[PDB]
Paper text:
Cobra cytotoxins (CTs) belong to the three-fingered protein family and possess membrane activity. Three-finger toxins (TFTs) are disulfide-rich proteins from the venoms of cobras, kraits, coral, and some other snakes. Their fold features three distinct β-structural “fingers”, emerging from a globular core stapled by four conserved disulfide bridges. Cardiotoxins, or cytotoxins (CTs), are one of the largest groups of TFTs, affecting the integrity of lipid membranes, and/or influencing the activity of membrane proteins and the associated signaling cascades. For the first time, a spatial model of CT13Nn with both “water” and “membrane” conformations of the central loop (loop-2) were determined by X-ray crystallography.
Structures of hexagonal (with three molecules in the asymmetric unit denoted A, B, and C) and orthorhombic (with six molecules in an asymmetric unit denoted A, B, C, D, E, and F) crystal forms were solved at 2.3 and 2.6 Å-resolution, respectively. The electron density for molecules D, E, and F of the orthorhombic structure is considerably poorer than for three other molecules, which is also reflected in the higher B-factor. RMSD for Cα atoms of molecule A of the orthorhombic structure superimposed on the other five molecules ranges from 0.39 to 1.45 Å. Significant difference between E subunit of the orthorhombic structure and most other subunits could be explained by an unusual conformation of loop-2 in all subunits, except E. Previously, this was not observed in crystal structures of homologues. Comparison of subunit E with the NMR structure of CT2Nk (in aqueous solution) showed that the conformations of the loops were very similar. Unusual conformation of the loop-2 in all subunits of the hexagonal and most subunits of the orthorhombic form was similar to that found by NMR for cytotoxin 1 from N. oxiana (5NQ4) in DPC micelle. Superimposition of the models (except E) over residues 22–36 resulted in RMSD values in the range of 0.8 to 1.1 Å. Specifically, for model E the respective RMSD value was 1.8 Å. Superimposition of subunit E and A of CT13Nn demonstrated that the tip of the loop-2 was repulsed from the hydrophobic amino acid residues 8–9 of loop-1 of the neighboring subunit B due to crystal packing. For the first time, in this work the structure similar to the membrane-bound conformation of functionally important loop-2 of an S-type CT was observed in the two crystal forms.
Residue numbers in the entry: 1 to 60
Write the structure that this text describes.
Amino acid sequence: LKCNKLIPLAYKTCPAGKNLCYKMFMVSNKTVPVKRGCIDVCPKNSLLVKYVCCNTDRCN
C-alpha cells in the first residue's frame, strides 16, 4: 500500500498493519483535505472531522 500524502505528487509506502489510504477533511468532505496518509481502520466521522478511506495504491 502506497498512500498519497497532503500533496498527492508525493506518497509513502504504508507500514505493516495499516492497509487503508485516508483523506481527512475539516467540517465537510465537499472541502479540501487537510491530511492524507495510511491507517488501519477508517475513523468514525465526528462533527468537525471527516475521513474517506480506500484500500488501493494512491487511491487517496
